[PDB]
């Protein structure tokens, strides 16, 4: 029983569905996430829809509100789970 | 496949496109970012559209929701990536 | 001079008025706060309008966006200041 | 070039203009800030428009979304920069 | 006396009612929470309405804005209290 059903889920709203991401490198994500809950600390790389992709020196419990298209595997040492 | 397409990207919304910033010191940023994901810890300086510019003693994983026009290079010891 | 006067103060908006809370344990709060800025670390107990009251193992600088009716004094070892 | 121009700057929106605050202790702030980016750690005191003023045991990189009228100098050991 | 009564409680709004969660494993939560205030550190598992369920290596004071249907007990070593 959710009292917050019939509310529209916006981008600023909390995470409704989650899925662990695997760094495919060559294909985009199946769904692009609103945020990334990082599982373990490390460096991981993220790509926009514009190709600009950079490396993030992320921390373990860090949750970063970036919305990526593709997560590559070359510089990725940190596993994450995408929130949506 | 994004289920949150057709949603308008507001200022409070998560980061859609990112770009690493270089402290030009003499020119403004190409796009002013909504926030700054700091890459490595240090001090970095940020300028408004009003010139008020101060120094921030920022930390490594810190993400600070300030929207600067120019990032100078004089006091900048911390590299960042702008979010937008 | 506030440029953000004539803006409506919502629940998600920053704290306009603050007041330190004392754990009365028998009366409700004079105003229920939007959030609790914790002053010193410890455990403190908080009650809803439904009576469900639990204990929170809070930390010193932690700021927790819970909106309580009554703050009891039995398990309260942490002083806070309510934000509103 | 800002793509988020023509967007209204709300209270929940990121910081557009910043200014370092000095604890005058007898005059109000020139502009009241939406938030306070703390520069160095310590204790600092903040006053509402209702006079309620308390002391905050703040930390160094802490950013606290309280909107004060006056920042006094008696208990202030922490320098901050106001965001707006 | 709440001055923020007659305001609609949205998903982004602060926590109105809280309840401690027990990892039933076999039944869903009585109310699905907007967020989870973690009581003690550990690993705990959370399930969507889509079954995708993963394990989160959460920390003690961490508050994670994920909205789960069921909290299982197999991998759960961290007690939490749901916010709503």
């Amino acid at each position: 029983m959710d009292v917050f059903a019939k509310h529209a889920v916006s981008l600023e709203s909390p995470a409704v569905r989650h899925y662990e991401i695997t760094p495919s490198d060559s294909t985009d994500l199946a769904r692009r996430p609103r945020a990334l809950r990082v599982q373990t600390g490390g460096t991981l790389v993220l790509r926009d829809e514009t190709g600009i992709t950079v490396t993030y020196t992320v921390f373990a419990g860090e949750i970063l509100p970036v919305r990526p298209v593709r997560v590559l595997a070359t510089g990725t040492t940190a596993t994450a789970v995408g929130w949506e | 496949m994004d289920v949150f397409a057709k949603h308008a990207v507001s200022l409070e919304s998560p980061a859609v496109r990112h770009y690493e910033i270089t402290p030009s010191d003499s020119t403004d940023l190409a796009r002013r970012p909504r926030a700054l994901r700091v890459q490595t810890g240090g001090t970095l300086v940020l300028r408004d559209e009003t010139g008020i510019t101060v120094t921030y003693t920022v930390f490594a994983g810190e993400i600070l929701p300030v929207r600067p026009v120019r990032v100078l290079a004089t006091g900048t010891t911390a590299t960042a990536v702008g979010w937008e | 001079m506030d440029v953000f006067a004539k803006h409506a103060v919502s629940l998600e908006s920053p704290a306009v008025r603050h007041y330190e809370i004392t754990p009365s344990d028998s009366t409700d709060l004079a105003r229920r706060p939007r959030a609790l800025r914790v002053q010193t670390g410890g455990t403190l107990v908080l009650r809803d309008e439904t009576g469900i009251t639990v204990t929170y193992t809070v930390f010193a600088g932690e700021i927790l966006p819970v909106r309580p009716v009554r703050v009891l004094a039995t398990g309260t070892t942490a002083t806070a200041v309510g934000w509103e | 070039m800002d793509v988020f121009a023509k967007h209204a700057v709300s209270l929940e929106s990121p910081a557009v203009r910043h200014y370092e605050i000095t604890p005058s202790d007898s005059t109000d702030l020139a502009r009241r800030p939406r938030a306070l980016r703390v520069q160095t750690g310590g204790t600092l005191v903040l006053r509402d428009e209702t006079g309620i003023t308390v002391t905050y045991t703040v930390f160094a990189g802490e950013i606290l979304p309280v909107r004060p009228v006056r920042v006094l100098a008696t208990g202030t050991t922490a320098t901050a920069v106001g965001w707006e | 006396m709440d001055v923020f009564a007659k305001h609609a409680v949205s998903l982004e709004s602060p926590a109105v009612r809280h309840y401690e969660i027990t990892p039933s494993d076999s039944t869903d939560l009585a109310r699905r929470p907007r967020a989870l205030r973690v009581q003690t550190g550990g690993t705990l598992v959370l399930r969507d309405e889509t079954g995708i369920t993963v394990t989160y290596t959460v920390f003690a004071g961490e508050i994670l804005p994920v909205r789960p249907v069921r909290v299982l007990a197999t991998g759960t070593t961290a007690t939490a209290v749901g916010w709503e």
């Binding site: 995470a15 | 980061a15 | 920053p14 966006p65 | 929106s13 | 998903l11 967020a35």
Partner: peptide, 10 residues
């Protein structure tokens, strides 16, 4: 979650 400054839940 995202880039506001608001003491909110998410």
């Amino acid at each position: 979650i995202a880039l506001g400054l608001g003491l909110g839940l998410a």
